[PDB]
Ligand binder design. Structure first.
Ligand SMILES: [Ca+2]
Ligand SMILES: [Ca+2]
Ligand SMILES: [Ca+2]
Ligand SMILES: [Fe+2]
Ligand SMILES: [Fe+2]
Ligand SMILES: [Fe+2]
Ligand SMILES: [Fe+2]
Lengths: 511, 167, 388, 387, 511
């Protein structure tokens, strides 16, 4: 009779589906072509209290490791210089993905009509807040205990200087919250996390460990335990709308668009950060990509949803074709524009060129020689008066920015895709790098009006832009970004000014 | 003075806005601004790098003036132009539902934003419109999304093909 | 194997040697403070501020933003990912808000977790101690099961009212506070059900099904206007600030506080019910924690904004007037519940005084902050009309 | 410097290489389970048992010991560091006891810390929410401050009663439990004072000084026999098991539970006081926690000892009888407290119902375990005669 | 008002002193010659709840580091074999010191009459419980994840086989609880903790790190934070009796007896564990001991208690003279009796012998030559039939156990002290190694009747004792103890049985 008794989460969750009630205006406030099933269920039976507890336990182990042992081992310092820089980008860029995912799932929570589906999205809303604070903590920790705090300590504002940031906001910010809630869900859960994010998070802990970084594995491995639950949400989105006629009409189109959007950015960027932002290599991007996208995702994961009308993205073939040299094509551009970043970059060393050539036949004859020339031109030395961008100008190799994906491309030099489509519309010029992004713009002109760095910086001298956007170190003179990762001979704002580099919009050449 | 966040163009508009001390005048300037500088249908791209910022500064002035001039009922239910918000919302949605194609629908939605974006129309009605108009627009646009060849789509959009390159 | 196959740069001799050799002699910058450019609200920058402020990638055209340019991808039609157009309120900087309790994710789940584990211990001590024996049966089966139970739907609706804000909030600090205000509401709704589930285990015949509480909420009279108000606040409000403001600084501040504190918290003890007050203690703790954040955002930041103070107060006064009527109606209908109590439980004077406590606290904590001219006796008189 | 001057063997290339070279190919024993030789109380050995059982270096001459030989250094006179002579009870193994809650230090402070922090949050909300407005002034300034405060000296005395057991306990599992039982008691006493200190902060003329409540305890009538039973359990008992048994399975189970649960926890609510019950909720959660440990030691282990079952039950029945008298007396004196309550607060029918709740729960939870034949009616009457 | 209000520990502790009340039998239940003033205060104003919180926070970090990062780094394995073994003794031996400290402080809590002093000892009671479980956790963790669990997994029973354990119980068990409460307080706090334990805990984390062990530092550094609190208790114990006339008559003799008792064991044992149980050295023990005992404790610490009549131990100079070679002398015995331990020992390698000679001139000519002689003879090879105990017998070097300290000593071989006093009393022989211990026994014969290993094992064959006391590894054949730390050629019970080693009571040689 007086036996110690209590109540658990599942016991309360049993009645959660009944919490919602009917009334005329009980409907999503967001535009959508789909209808989410009113009796959709969720995989995990959680309530606020239990959610907090399981997450609190993870924080304990994580922060305990970071504040105690890892700090005592000077783990924040004993990491390869190139990797310390790579994490400035990796952690802050992923941070924004985590952040926008909060808003995105708040939007899905609004979309779902079944109490259980709302609750599933709700747990993700809280998880993405945790992940935002976690990625933030990684930069916070490396800034406080690492070899180079610059960039780690102000990325939220210094990332605005460079072009790589624009593409990140497309796939991990706007792509997550702007559009049909279902389209957003595909970018976030069905494609983003399932195809790239989750495999990426794990991969990063491996590359991190290999390069001496035990900070990232501690945090990211914890982030990973939460992501295993976010898969259920993405899968549940498709289930909730499969019994609706609209699905057969629009689902595969939103998915294909979502797939191309995500891949377009991560195919070249992830491989770039992995192979060029590390000393010790874990695996060639070419094989990693094919396993992630073609096999795991585009085969296993996608196949399971065939029973819901889901098909393999029609652009998958093109994606593979353009994928091979993509990241290599991009690093040339990222290094050439190194003064616009918030991180230090390094030319491939002798050993690395062998690895690249060994894993990518033909790399040396193209990229290898180019880097060797830039080195000869003094790209690493501050008194050289040389920046790779100048080389692109001298050899008439214009760099364009895709109006849709924001991904930088140089068709006249790339070994990969060399397509370029230029249109004039109502007094504005537009440059596209592929047939999928071009269709997106033609069909949805008003969704893609993002001004590119050349448009914004047109007629502006390089050093003035860097200075205005706070791209300097605490001494107020040395640049945050560097063309090498050594501790001496760091470029200053004055070294940049002397180059007298003035941006120009490459599209203005067209008549 | 040609900065990203601070420049002569922005300063000039701040001064211009400082002289909008009447609701009707301020509201009219805001709508005109939107027709001239926003969306792919803008009359010109001359303020491309600063229009987003200037538009917000213009909105602030209209908002402040509207709150001072309107009684509580009108602030909640009328547009800055004195129209009844519900009527405008319903009338626009009705037109959207009568739209024959995706080309007609996009003009309706886009034009609605240009003319009624807060602080012209009360946010409650405006976002309810986004909800309804956006739905139809997408339904029309996403149907057989890939059927039209790019060659033909460029013509439908009416772009001037300047340059084409292919390996 | 004992050592494993994967070599780690931190411990592998060969790799570590390579890493150490490439290291600089000292940090390439002595400014090791992430978020150093953030204006501190207090003496020194807090962890809360560093890990949160400016996480939102807003451009300068959204008050306070540090980025530039339009969004990369917008909604069909052109609607921006985030924009000034989603709320009537204006400000010099959307990043000014600060949760006075400085709650980022870690401290937040830590505290709730402590409350969860303690709640579980409490229930096991309560059931093992047989304290249920002294609880009045009628209060338990009628008022806790049906009426307290029906209130779970009120809290659930207020929770859902936050969905659009979680998506539209114009800054990181406001989004995190809003997320937490909403999460605490769903928690309370779940604690009401938790209690009903607990009672069903220690009290034979007690049905934990939500059918009865839900029928009370959807079709009863006592909560009719309350439900009508919640349905409006949740689904008829498309402005994220009108939603949060009206919910926390109007409806929940008057109706919510009256029901939780002046009815159940106040009367349960008179029927030998220490069970319900345990959970209401959590609800009130949550209410007071949220109040601080609600006041900082709407009064300290917006209502006192250096450039839009007058405008924002005008708007909030408008909202207060808009939602005060439906709130008085909710309270008015709720008055009907007093006639259901056993004779002698309480009287008109006690009820009136308790009503004045809620209204006076509301005037002090909210109305007065925006110069809303509330008439306390007129408000109470209007509510008392509901006494059957 | 950035790298520091101290070289660590786990990360230093040279040192680590030397260490790795000296390592065996695989562990020199596959049994990686510390405490593997301990007899599991449950399905599998718990972390609680592994880290606790056999920490006490007892020799085999102390039932259960695994060591051998006399102690290395004893008291002047020859008294052993630990010995069978420190308690009447006998057993086949002093390490048999098991805390049902499996509390070692870590989980113990984790739980109390959560309670401390939630307590802080509760008070901040309570004061901000102005809930004090609905509390009865007389109940506050007279029954909470004077009579509830006085009871803190009761719990405090019970706390101290554990000092000797902390020194004489014959096993680790029993020492840890005893320690926690006592620490929770001082916690309650400190919580009673915390409430008085809180009231002092939000109630302008409230005095937190223990002067009033202390004088009530030392020279009052309400707790006279209560204090007499406390001074005895604490300083007159020299047998650590008698002290723990008599305090938890007799006195506090009767007097203590009646005062905490049946008087303040039952009446405070009627005066618009949800504050006091917030703390009594803790004291009760604690009481029920300690009860499982008390039962497992004196009943499951000693009372039902495979060899001294009869013997121990006789000794505990003796102690029960020995202390059931001072306990019943303490209750009687407490009865005179109702007279000071406002008219209509409670009737004799309610108290009799409450008294039987305490007595019946006692018989079902303790008395019946050692075959102590207690008469519910006579006990209730002897106590009820104090009105 | 309604401003958020609460109450802290200090505000409640403000009235803690008034919690105690007067009454006839309100006095200590333990025999004592002193009177602790009932107006004594404590340094820290804690209440049970705040105490738990500050400790809970420490556990968080500690366990978080252990379960997460440290485990991910395989910290339990990458430790030098010699150190893995040394931690079996260090952790388990200190564990009993932590455990008896619970009872000791419980006895001191009963002794104190002032509520605050009682509260001070109480906080320590709980701390010592935490330390017991912390030391337990170290063995638990090395057993779970280490290179050799044997010993770590069962030290609580396997430690009873060897002689080093007897002396540990004298200083850290019986010394802490048997005698005048004040005497125990001096063994525990004034000497044990202030002079040895505290400096030792920190030192151990230093030797641990040098040998690759990051587990112990994570735990021991946490224990240290608590110990900085117990200093106040020992100090307050003296302040509580300084006014009692008995103090001037007894304090200094109890202290001197306490000093000798503690140093008698730790002087040789700690130096041995540090220098012989490690590969990488941190500092010579001669240097360490002098700083700890003479400079820090016997000088500064003790010096500050002078105002309370406390004088430097009269046996101090004696302790310094017997110290120099003490640890070196003892390792010879510990290794010669290696089959009686629960850990594996190693002889000094070439680099170490050079280190010993450099730091202890003359070391090689005595200890070095002996070790090389034993090794060439095959003391490490189970097929040799040789155990160093035989060499002691052959060369007529009897090994005795001090009746008081239980410390093993060999006066005919020792390079350190070589005094020996043998007495007979009522049919029993007694062996003493110093003049202070001899007095203790002469004045208090009934306090010291501990049987030594030769007395208990007299006439028993070595392998039988080991088998009976479970000195075997999982396979039931291989010994836990070993004369080397390599993974091959481990001695078995059979290898020992064949030696036909039978214990004899060495004192009977005098008849
Ligand atoms: Ca042209
Ligand atoms: Ca009605
Ligand atoms: Ca009345
Ligand atoms: Fe995430
Ligand atoms: Fe996710
Ligand atoms: Fe300790
Ligand atoms: Fe200690």
């Amino acid at each position: 009779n007086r036996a110690p008794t209590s109540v658990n989460a599942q016991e309360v969750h049993r009645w959660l589906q009944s919490f919602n009630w009917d009334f005329k205006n009980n409907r999503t406030k967001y535009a959508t072509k789909y209808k989410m099933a009113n009796e959709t269920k969720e995989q995990f039976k959680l309530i606020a209290k239990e959610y907090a507890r399981m997450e609190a336990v993870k924080d304990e182990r994580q922060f305990g490791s970071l504040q105690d042992a890892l700090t005592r081992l000077n783990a924040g310092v004993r990491v390869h210089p190139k990797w310390n820089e790579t994490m400035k980008v990796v952690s802050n860029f992923l941070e924004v993905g985590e952040y926008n995912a909060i808003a995105a799932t708040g939007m899905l929570w609004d979309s779902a009509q079944a109490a259980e589906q709302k609750n599933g999205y709700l747990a993700q809303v809280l998880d993405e807040i945790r992940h935002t604070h976690q990625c933030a903590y990684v930069n916070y920790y490396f800034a406080k205990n690492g070899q180079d705090p610059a960039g780690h300590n102000d990325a939220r504002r210094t990332r605005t200087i460079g072009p790589l940031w624009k593409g990140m906001k497309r796939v991990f910010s706007d792509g997550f919250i702007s559009g049909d809630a279902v389209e957003c869900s595909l970018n976030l859960q069905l494609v983003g996390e399932a195809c790239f994010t989750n495999p990426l998070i794990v991969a990063v802990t491996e590359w991190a460990a290999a390069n001496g970084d035990e900070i990232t594995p501690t945090v990211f491995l914890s982030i990973e335990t939460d992501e295993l639950r976010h898969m259920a949400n993405g899968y549940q989105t498709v289930v909730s709308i499969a019994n609706d006629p609209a699905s057969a009409k629009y689902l595969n189109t939103d998915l294909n668009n979502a797939f191309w959007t995500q891949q377009k950015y991560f195919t070249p960027v992830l491989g770039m950060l992995f192979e060029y932002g590390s000393k010790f290599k874990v695996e060639p991007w070419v094989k990693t990509w094919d396993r992630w996208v073609y096999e795991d995702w585009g085969g296993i994961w996608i196949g399971r949803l065939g029973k819901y009308g889901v098909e393999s993205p029609r652009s998958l073939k093109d994606a593979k074709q353009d994928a091979y040299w993509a990241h290599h094509d991009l690093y040339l551009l990222a290094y050439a524009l190194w003064p616009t970043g918030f991180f230090r970059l390094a030319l491939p060393d002798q050993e690395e060129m062998e690895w690249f050539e060994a894993n990518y036949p033909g790399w040396y004859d193209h990229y290898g020689k180019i880097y060797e020339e830039w080195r000869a031109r003094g790209c690493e030395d501050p008194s050289s008066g040389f920046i790779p961008l100048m080389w692109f100008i001298e050899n008439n190799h214009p760099i364009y920015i895709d109006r849709v994906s924001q991904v930088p491309f140089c068709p006249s030099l790339a070994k990969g895709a060399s397509t370029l489509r230029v249109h004039e519309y109502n007094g504005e010029m537009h440059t596209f790098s592929d047939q999928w992004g071009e269709r997106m713009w033609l069909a949805e002109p008003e969704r893609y009006e993002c001004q590119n760095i050349f448009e914004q910086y047109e007629g502006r001298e390089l050093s003035e832009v860097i200075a205005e956007l706070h791209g300097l170190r605490s001494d107020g003179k040395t640049l945050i970004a560097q063309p090498h990762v050594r501790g001496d001979k760091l470029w200053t704002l004055d070294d940049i000014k002397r180059l007298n580099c003035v941006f120009k919009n490459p599209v203005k050449a067209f008549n | 003075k040609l900065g990203i966040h601070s420049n002569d163009t922005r300063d000039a508009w701040v001064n211009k806005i400082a002289q909008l001390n009447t609701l009707e005048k301020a509201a009219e300037m805001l709508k005109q601004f939107r027709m001239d500088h926003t969306t792919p249908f803008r009359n010109s791209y001359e303020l491309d790098n600063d229009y987003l910022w200037i538009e917000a500064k213009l909105e602030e002035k209209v908002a402040v003036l509207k709150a001072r001039a309107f009684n509580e009922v009108d602030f909640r239910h009328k547009t800055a132009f004195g129209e009844d918000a519900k009527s405008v919302l319903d009338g626009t949605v009705a037109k959207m539902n009568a739209a024959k194609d995706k080309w007609e629908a996009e003009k309706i939605h886009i034009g609605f934003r240009q003319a009624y974006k807060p602080p012209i129309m009360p946010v409650n009605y405006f976002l309810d419109g986004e909800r309804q108009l956006g739905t139809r627009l997408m339904e029309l646009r996403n149907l057989n999304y890939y059927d039209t060849p790019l060659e033909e789509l460029r013509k439908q959009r009416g772009v001037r093909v300047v340059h084409l390159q292919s390996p | 194997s004992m050592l494993g196959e994967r070599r780690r740069g931190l411990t592998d001799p060969e790799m570590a040697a390579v890493i150490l050799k490439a290291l600089p002699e000292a940090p390439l910058d002595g400014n090791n403070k992430m978020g150093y450019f953030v204006t501190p609200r207090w003496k020194r920058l807090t962890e809360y501020e560093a890990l949160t402020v400016y996480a939102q990638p807003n451009a300068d055209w959204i008050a306070g933003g540090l980025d530039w340019g339009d969004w990369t991808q917008k909604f069909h039609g052109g609607r921006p990912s985030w924009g000034n157009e989603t709320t009537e309120l204006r400000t010099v900087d959307w990043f000014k808000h600060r949760d006075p309790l400085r709650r980022w994710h870690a401290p937040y789940v830590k505290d709730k977790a402590e409350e969860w584990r303690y709640t579980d211990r409490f229930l096991q001590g309560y059931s093992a101690d047989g304290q249920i024996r002294a609880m009045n049966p009628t209060w338990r089966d009628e008022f806790i099961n049906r009426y307290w139970g029906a209130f779970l739907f009120n809290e659930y609706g207020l929770f859902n009212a936050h969905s659009q804000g979680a998506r539209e909030a114009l800054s990181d600090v406001t989004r995190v506070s809003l997320a937490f205000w909403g999460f605490d509401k769903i928690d309370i709704a779940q604690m009401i059900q938790l209690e009903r589930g607990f009672l069903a285990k220690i009290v034979p015949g007690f049905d934990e099904s939500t059918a009865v509480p839900k029928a009370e909420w959807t079709n009863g009279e006592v909560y009719k206007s309350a439900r009508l108000a919640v349905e409006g606040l949740w689904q008829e409000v498309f402005d994220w600030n009108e939603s949060a403001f009206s919910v926390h600084a109007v409806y929940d501040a008057l109706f919510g506080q009256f029901v939780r504190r002046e009815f159940f918290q106040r009367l349960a003890p008179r029927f030998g019910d220490n069970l319900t007050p345990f959970f209401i203690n959590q609800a009130q703790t949550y209410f007071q924690i949220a109040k601080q954040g609600v006041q900082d955002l709407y009064y300290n930041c917006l209502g006192d904004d250096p450039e839009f103070s007058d405008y924002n107060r005008t708007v909030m006064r408008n909202w207060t007037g808009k939602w005060l009527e439906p709130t008085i109606a909710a309270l008015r209908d709720f008055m009907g519940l007093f006639a259901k109590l056993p004779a002698g439980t309480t009287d008109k004077e006690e009820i009136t005084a308790s009503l004045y406590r809620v209204v006076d606290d509301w005037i002090e904590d909210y109305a007065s902050r925006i110069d809303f001219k509330a008439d306390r006796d007129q408000i109470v008189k209007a509510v008392l009309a509901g006494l059957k």
